[PDB]
Every structure is written in structure tokens, then in C-alpha cells.
Design an enzyme around this catalytic site. Structure first.
Site, mmCIF file in Angstrom:
data_model
loop_
_atom_site.group_PDB
_atom_site.id
_atom_site.type_symbol
_atom_site.label_atom_id
_atom_site.label_comp_id
_atom_site.label_asym_id
_atom_site.label_seq_id
_atom_site.Cartn_x
_atom_site.Cartn_y
_atom_site.Cartn_z
ATOM 1 N N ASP A 156 55.513 36.023 49.944
ATOM 2 C CA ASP A 156 54.424 35.296 48.995
ATOM 3 C C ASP A 156 53.414 35.921 48.472
ATOM 4 O OD1 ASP A 156 53.001 33.617 47.588
ATOM 5 O OD2 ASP A 156 52.333 32.293 49.436
ATOM 6 N N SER B 174 49.017 38.519 30.364
ATOM 7 C CA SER B 174 50.212 38.665 29.551
ATOM 8 C C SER B 174 49.667 38.662 28.028
ATOM 9 C CB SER B 174 51.223 37.456 29.587
ATOM 10 O OG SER B 174 52.342 37.588 28.829
#
Length: 330
Positions: free
Chosen positions: A35, A199
Site C-alpha cells: 500500500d 498530473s
């Protein structure tokens, strides 16, 4: 040193991925959920409340000759999905794919929430976010990667998650045969303890690319892609009959639909998520309403590039002094 381990989807939807991890001496192999959005290595154990264990493999520290109780240390964690767990702490030898760390903090669960009990395939979590998020008290502990870093050939790990198939976590090297083209690296902020990046935009299907900064985290422990409501609405508007259902808890769509791809930007590069990766199947057995793999982050507080996005890429988690993330198509 290096390590390399195969990671396997737990079910036919790729809801999560499990990777075998050797703990203790002799080794006890547990299948952990790696994770990158958390920083605790915790396991079901011989200390876990018996009624909260339902099929998981447990770590028994009393059977490990290298286990040592970390005196006074406790841990307690709550995840973004509302699940939680807590317990005490041992140090022990932990190996992943041939890479060994001695003295790793292994957080032994005394209690786990129902969602963990109900998932017999996941024996614990191995956190790969920054150690500043580790919950051990009163002395915070280091992640497996943080402990291994100095010994690795290069201070990196890579995630290569499969679509409906196994993939690979590598430590200490970048397998140049595992991706196409080049890896585009992008800046990371560690201020919230995550692999947080920006992004450069998105496209829906064959539509035009929208240049817009989207800050979010690369999180292998989250199944879906959580993005701003504007972006998510633009995606689902291209699927006839798709709608946000308050009762189901997100966007649903007719199971008869063909989903468009979703592209996200990494610098000037583009990662394309095929439409099929966005199908999470019937909302309940036999239903013709299917659950979408792109959902709004509006109620989270952060955008999350979970498995839906990451499995479309070869992803480099570069833990150099100034960390960065790399993405390549594959």
C-alpha cells in the site's frame, strides 16, 4: 541488493493485490496488500481477537526465534475507506522477493475492523508511503522500503500491476524490459506523507486532451481512480445511461455499455487506461447496473490515482533524497 515478488489480484475484479512476504525464523509467509498510501506493516496474528479472524494466515511471534517485542509500542490506524486496525509491535526479519530487512517493525493486530475480517485473502498490509505516516507510538517506525533503501542497488521500488493478471513489485532496480517507450519522471511532494504528484491533464476516449493540473497521490492500496467531480462527470457523460447514484455510492452504468478509455497526463507523456479497466461489475450479484472505476474525490479531500490508473502503467517510486515518481506505458 534487490528483491522481486509477484503480486496477484485477490479476485476477478482486481479489488486488491496480494504479495507473499516472509516474516520471522523459520519463515512465516503471509500475503500482504502492498500500500503506497500508508506506512504501517501490520499483520493478522496469534494476538488477533479470535472472532475477527476468518480464514487469514496469522503471524505467531512466539514461533519466530528472531521476533522481539518492541516494549511499550502500540499502533492504531484508520484508512480512507473507514476500516481500521490496532495492536502491539514486534521487530523481526522480513523478506520480500529475496530482499531481507532485519529488525523490521511488524505490527501485530489485536483488533481489526469487519472489512478486514471479511476478506480472507489479505493477511495484512505492507505500507510503502513515507515513514512520517507510520502510526507506532511512542516511537514511530520505518517502512520496509525505508529500512531496505540504503542496501538497495538503487533507492527505488516499482509497481507493475496486472489487469486481471499477476504483476510484479521490484525493489532496488528498474526492469527495462517491463515497459515500452521511456519513463517520464515527475515531481513529488512528501508534505502529507504520500507519493503526491500533479498530473498535467486528461482526455476521455478519443477526445481532446484537457491541460489542467490535478494534484493527487499514487496509491496502490486504493482500488479505484478518484478525481475531481468535473473530470468524473465529463467521463461518465460519454457513457449512455451512466449516472451518479447516491444510494449505491457513486457512478453506475449499464452493464451492456462499452466504456471509453481515460487518459491522464504525466508531464508531456500520456497514460491510457483502457475502458475495460474501468468496469467493476454488477453492483450486486445478477444486477445489470455496474459500478464505475472512476469516481469523484469530492468527499475525500484528495485525488487518488489508485489501481485503476496505476495498473495501466509501469510506475517507479524513486526514494532518492528528493523523491520523484516515474510512469511508463507497458
Amino acid at each position: 541488493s534487490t528483491g522481486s515478488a509477484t503480486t496477484t489480484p485477490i479476485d476477478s475484479l482486481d479489488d486488491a493485490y496480494i504479495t507473499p512476504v516472509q516474516i520471522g525464523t523459520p519463515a512465516q509467509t503471509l500475503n500482504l496488500d502492498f500500500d503506497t498510501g500508508s506506512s504501517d506493516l501490520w499483520v493478522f496474528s496469534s494476538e488477533t481477537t479470535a472472532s475477527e479472524v476468518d480464514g487469514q494466515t496469522i503471524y505467531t511471534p512466539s514461533k519466530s526465534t528472531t521476533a522481539k517485542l518492541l516494549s511499550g509500542a502500540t499502533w492504531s490506524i484508520s484508512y480512507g475507506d473507514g476500516s481500521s486496525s490496532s495492536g502491539d509491535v514486534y521487530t523481526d526479519t522480513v523478506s520480500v522477493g529475496g530482499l531481507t530487512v532485519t529488525g523490521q517493525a511488524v505490527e501485530s493486530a489485536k483488533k481489526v475492523s469487519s472489512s478486514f475480517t471479511e476478506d480472507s485473502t489479505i493477511d495484512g498490509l505492507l505500507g510503502l508511503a513515507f515513514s512520517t505516516l507510520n502510526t507506532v507510538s511512542p516511537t514511530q517506525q520505518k517502512t520496509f522500503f525505508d529500512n531496505a533503501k540504503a542496501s538497495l542497488d538503487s533507492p527505488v521500488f516499482t509497481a507493475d500491476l496486472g489487469y486481471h493478471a499477476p504483476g510484479t513489485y521490484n525493489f532496488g532496480f528498474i526492469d527495462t524490459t517491463a515497459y515500452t517507450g521511456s519513463i517520464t519522471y515527475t515531481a513529488v511532494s512528501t508534505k502529507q506523507g504520500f507519493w503526491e504528484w500533479t498530473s498535467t491533464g486528461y482526455a476521455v476516449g478519443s477526445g481532446t486532451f484537457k491541460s489542467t493540473s490535478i494534484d493527487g497521490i499514487a496509491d496502490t492500496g486504493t482500488t479505484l481512480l478518484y478525481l475531481p467531480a468535473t473530470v468524473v462527470s465529463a467521463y461518465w457523460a460519454q457513457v449512455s445511461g451512466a449516472k451518479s447514484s447516491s444510494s449505491v455510492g457513486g457512478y453506475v452504468f449499464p452493464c451492456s455499455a462499452t466504456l471509453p478509455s481515460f487518459t491522464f497526463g504525466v508531464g508531456s507523456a500520456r497514460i491510457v487506461i483502457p475502458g475495460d479497466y474501468i468496469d467493476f461489475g454488477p453492483i450486486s450479484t445478477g444486477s445489470s447496473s455496474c459500478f464505475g472505476g472512476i469516481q469523484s474525490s469530492a468527499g475525500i479531500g484528495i485525488n487518488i490515482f489508485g489501481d485503476v490508473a496505476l495498473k495501466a502503467a509501469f510506475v517507479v517510486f524513486n526514494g532518492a533524497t528528493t523523491p520523484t515518481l516515474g510512469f511508463a506505458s507497458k
